[PDB]
Amino acid sequence: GPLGSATLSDEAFIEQFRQELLNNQMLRSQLILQIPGLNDLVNDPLLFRERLGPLILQRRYGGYNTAMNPFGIPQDEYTRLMANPDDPDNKKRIAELLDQQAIDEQLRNAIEYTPE
C-alpha cells in the first residue's frame, strides 16, 4: 500500500539530511566548496542543527501548503463531483454551487448607484 512518510519535521528532516551528505561523497563535496567548514558542523549534531538550521529549513518552508477547491466544499465532496460529474445527482451539486456565484456576482458590480 501507500506506506508513505511525508512528515519530516525540522529535526527529522535536518537529522536525516546530515546523513545524506555523509552518505553521498559527491553531494557533500559540492557543498564543501560553498561551505568549507561543513565537515565541522556535520561532525557536531547540535551545531549542524543550529548553525545550518536556517539554511536547510529555507527549502522546506516557503509558504503554507494549500489545495482547497474553489467551490468551498468538504475535500471528500469535491472528489465525488469530479469523480462523477455526469451523475444526475452531482449535476445538482455543481449546478447550485455555480448559482451562488451568480448571485454574489450581482453584489460585486452592484448596479445600485445609490449605496445609501
CSV table of C-alpha atoms in Angstrom, one decimal:
chain,number,residue,atom,x,y,z
A,1,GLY,CA,0.0,0.0,0.0
A,2,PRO,CA,1.0,3.7,0.2
A,3,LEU,CA,3.1,3.5,3.4
A,4,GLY,CA,4.5,7.0,2.8
A,5,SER,CA,6.5,9.1,5.2
A,6,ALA,CA,5.7,12.7,4.5
A,7,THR,CA,6.3,14.3,7.9
A,8,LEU,CA,10.0,15.1,8.2
A,9,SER,CA,9.9,17.8,10.9
A,10,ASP,CA,12.8,20.2,11.3
A,11,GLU,CA,14.9,17.9,13.4
A,12,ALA,CA,13.7,14.8,11.5
A,13,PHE,CA,14.5,16.4,8.1
A,14,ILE,CA,17.7,18.1,9.3
A,15,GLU,CA,18.8,14.9,11.2
A,16,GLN,CA,18.3,12.9,8.0
A,17,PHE,CA,19.7,15.5,5.7
A,18,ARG,CA,23.0,15.3,7.6
A,19,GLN,CA,23.2,11.6,6.8
A,20,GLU,CA,22.8,12.2,3.1
A,21,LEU,CA,25.9,14.4,2.9
A,22,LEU,CA,27.7,11.8,4.9
A,23,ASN,CA,26.3,9.0,2.7
A,24,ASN,CA,27.0,10.8,-0.6
A,25,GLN,CA,30.6,11.8,-1.1
A,26,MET,CA,29.8,13.5,-4.3
A,27,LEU,CA,26.9,15.6,-2.9
A,28,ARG,CA,28.8,16.8,0.1
A,29,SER,CA,31.9,17.6,-2.0
A,30,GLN,CA,29.8,20.1,-3.9
A,31,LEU,CA,28.9,21.8,-0.6
A,32,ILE,CA,32.4,21.8,0.8
A,33,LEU,CA,33.2,24.4,-1.9
A,34,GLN,CA,30.4,26.7,-0.8
A,35,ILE,CA,30.8,25.7,2.9
A,36,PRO,CA,34.4,24.6,3.6
A,37,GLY,CA,33.6,24.5,7.4
A,38,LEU,CA,30.9,21.9,6.6
A,39,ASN,CA,33.0,18.9,7.8
A,40,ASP,CA,33.0,20.8,11.1
A,41,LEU,CA,29.2,21.4,11.6
A,42,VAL,CA,28.4,17.9,10.3
A,43,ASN,CA,30.8,16.4,12.9
A,44,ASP,CA,28.6,18.1,15.5
A,45,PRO,CA,24.8,17.3,15.8
A,46,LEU,CA,23.7,20.3,17.8
A,47,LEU,CA,25.6,22.8,15.6
A,48,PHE,CA,24.6,21.2,12.4
A,49,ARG,CA,21.1,21.9,13.6
A,50,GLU,CA,21.5,25.4,14.9
A,51,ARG,CA,24.3,26.6,12.6
A,52,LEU,CA,22.8,25.0,9.4
A,53,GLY,CA,19.2,25.1,10.6
A,54,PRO,CA,18.0,28.3,8.9
A,55,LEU,CA,19.7,27.0,5.7
A,56,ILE,CA,18.1,23.6,5.5
A,57,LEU,CA,14.7,24.9,6.6
A,58,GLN,CA,14.8,27.6,4.0
A,59,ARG,CA,14.0,24.9,1.4
A,60,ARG,CA,11.3,23.1,3.4
A,61,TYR,CA,9.5,26.3,4.3
A,62,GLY,CA,8.4,28.9,1.8
A,63,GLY,CA,4.6,29.2,2.2
A,64,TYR,CA,1.7,27.3,3.9
A,65,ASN,CA,0.5,24.4,1.8
A,66,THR,CA,-3.0,24.6,0.3
A,67,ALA,CA,-5.2,23.0,-2.3
A,68,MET,CA,-8.8,23.6,-1.4
A,69,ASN,CA,-11.5,23.5,-4.0
A,70,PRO,CA,-13.0,26.9,-5.3
A,71,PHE,CA,-16.5,25.6,-4.6
A,72,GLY,CA,-15.6,25.6,-0.9
A,73,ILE,CA,-16.9,22.1,-0.1
A,74,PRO,CA,-15.6,19.2,2.1
A,75,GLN,CA,-12.5,17.8,0.4
A,76,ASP,CA,-14.4,14.5,0.3
A,77,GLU,CA,-17.3,16.2,-1.5
A,78,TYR,CA,-15.2,17.8,-4.3
A,79,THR,CA,-13.8,14.4,-5.1
A,80,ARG,CA,-17.3,13.0,-5.6
A,81,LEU,CA,-18.1,15.7,-8.1
A,82,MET,CA,-15.1,15.4,-10.4
A,83,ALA,CA,-15.2,11.6,-9.9
A,84,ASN,CA,-18.6,11.6,-11.5
A,85,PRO,CA,-20.0,15.0,-12.6
A,86,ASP,CA,-22.2,13.2,-15.1
A,87,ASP,CA,-24.3,11.7,-12.3
A,88,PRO,CA,-27.9,13.4,-12.3
A,89,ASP,CA,-27.2,13.9,-8.6
A,90,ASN,CA,-23.8,15.6,-9.0
A,91,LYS,CA,-25.2,18.0,-11.6
A,92,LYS,CA,-27.3,19.4,-8.8
A,93,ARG,CA,-24.3,20.0,-6.6
A,94,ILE,CA,-22.3,21.6,-9.4
A,95,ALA,CA,-25.4,23.4,-10.5
A,96,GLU,CA,-26.2,25.2,-7.2
A,97,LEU,CA,-22.5,25.8,-6.5
A,98,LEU,CA,-22.3,28.0,-9.6
A,99,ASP,CA,-25.7,29.6,-8.9
A,100,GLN,CA,-24.4,31.1,-5.6
A,101,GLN,CA,-21.5,32.7,-7.5
A,102,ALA,CA,-24.0,34.2,-9.9
A,103,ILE,CA,-26.0,35.7,-7.1
A,104,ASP,CA,-22.9,37.1,-5.4
A,105,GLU,CA,-21.6,38.4,-8.7
A,106,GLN,CA,-24.5,40.9,-8.6
A,107,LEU,CA,-23.2,42.3,-5.3
A,108,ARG,CA,-19.7,42.7,-6.8
A,109,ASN,CA,-20.7,45.0,-9.5
A,110,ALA,CA,-23.8,46.2,-7.7
A,111,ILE,CA,-25.7,48.2,-10.4
A,112,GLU,CA,-27.1,50.1,-7.4
A,113,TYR,CA,-25.7,53.6,-8.0
A,114,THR,CA,-27.1,54.6,-4.6
A,115,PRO,CA,-25.3,52.9,-1.6
A,116,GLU,CA,-27.4,54.9,0.9
